[PDB]
């Protein structure tokens, strides 16, 4: 009965040369019992990508909530929300539930369409923004992901190289965690193309 480790799962994001990557596993369980191997944790609102780990009901709820909020934004603003702005919206929304929080670990990823700059960010369950040049990690194998990213990562990787780095970071981290894995998805994001790849990984 620790809300952030009932269902399991992980998300990681990285930056490269004029690109960003965000990846997640596919497991949803109930403690020891694996229930679903199709539960994606990465969503998008226009060109801004959001990954969410933690309690799966809150993952779903928050996706629905940010879709709602970014739809209204776009109608009023007459433009797509940018990553820097969305990051602030996520923070505000989480801190609104300060003493009854959503049990989640969200990760923002995307390229600002005006400046061309790759952007990633992470949050705690209560809204504190963690910005990074390099990588953001989240979920039940966050320790494992921190270790993988800190040793594998280098700056300014080409999209094809960055794919290999982020995939190896996720896979090897997931295999040292009982509650993560069961399939994986990687998103490679360039200024005006996005490539989504499913990874082959061990299914135990």
């Amino acid at each position: 009965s620790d809300p952030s480790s009932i269902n399991g799962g992980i998300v990681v994001a990285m930056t490269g040369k004029d690109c960003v990557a965000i990846a997640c596993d596919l497991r949803l369980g109930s403690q020891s019992l694996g229930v679903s191997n199709k539960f994606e944790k990465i969503f998008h609102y226009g060109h801004v990508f959001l990954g969410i780990t933690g309690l799966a009901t809150d993952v779903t709820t928050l996706n629905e909530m940010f879709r709602y909020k970014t739809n209204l934004y776009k109608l009023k603003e007459e433009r797509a929300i940018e990553p820097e702005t969305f990051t602030q919206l996520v923070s505000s929304s989480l801190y609104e539930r300060r003493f009854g929080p959503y049990f989640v670990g969200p990760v923002v990823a995307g390229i600002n369409s005006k400046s061309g700059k790759p952007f990633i960010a992470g949050f705690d369950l209560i809204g504190c923004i963690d910005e990074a040049k390099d990588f953001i990690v989240s979920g039940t194998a966050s320790d494992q992901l921190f270790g993988m990213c800190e040793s594998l990562y280098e700056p300014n990787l080409e999209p094809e190289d960055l794919f290999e780095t982020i995939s190896q970071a996720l896979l090897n981290a997931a295999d040292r965690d009982a509650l993560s894995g069961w399939g994986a998805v990687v998103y490679i994001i360039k200024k005006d193309e996005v490539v989504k790849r499913y990874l082959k990984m061990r299914q135990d």
Partner: protein, 244 residues
Amino acid sequence: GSRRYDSRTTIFSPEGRLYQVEYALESISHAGTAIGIMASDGIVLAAERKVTSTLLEQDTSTEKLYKLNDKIAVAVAGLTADAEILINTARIHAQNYLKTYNEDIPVEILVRRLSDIKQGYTQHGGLRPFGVSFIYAGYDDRYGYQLYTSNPSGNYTGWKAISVGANTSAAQTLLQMDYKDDMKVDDAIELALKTLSKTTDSSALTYDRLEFATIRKGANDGEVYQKIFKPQEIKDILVKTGIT
């Protein structure tokens, strides 16, 4: 007390009409004309801006045509400020439905709720009604393309072609004359512009006094696109049909 200064906005006349609703409709009849035409492969929305000045910024302007979601738009006739209150309510209502059911809101459901809000202002609360008539243009996978209208009474109805605002009597006669069921979008575009051109209180219909939009399935395969026309695109479509 304050009884002295109460207009009693929600009462019946001896004839069984609602004073304030009737007077709001009289207000709307002086607003710029807006026309909706439903074709088999799309919908046209056309509206005449209220007497323009040459120093008005035309491109960054919105007065008549508003987007409610990706599948539904409205043409406005009446007080713009009143319309914006209602538009935001409608926009939120659409998003509530999407959040609840994970499906885009069916057009009639949205129209009914907006119309129900208007009705309330005529039965309780002692406030003036909204001085607005809407043309709703939209698509859903149940009924396909749909046109509706609502007015300050909260009454709504569905149409193949319809006008609101000024000179609706003349506009409706002209639409009734040239409309047919097998019509295409590009024909409907022409009918809309021709009708406004004849009913207008201006000397000649020009690009700078018009707002124009289409809702087509003319994207790529089985999906709906909203095109709010830019100034230059209205200038081109006005030349293409030989009005200017």
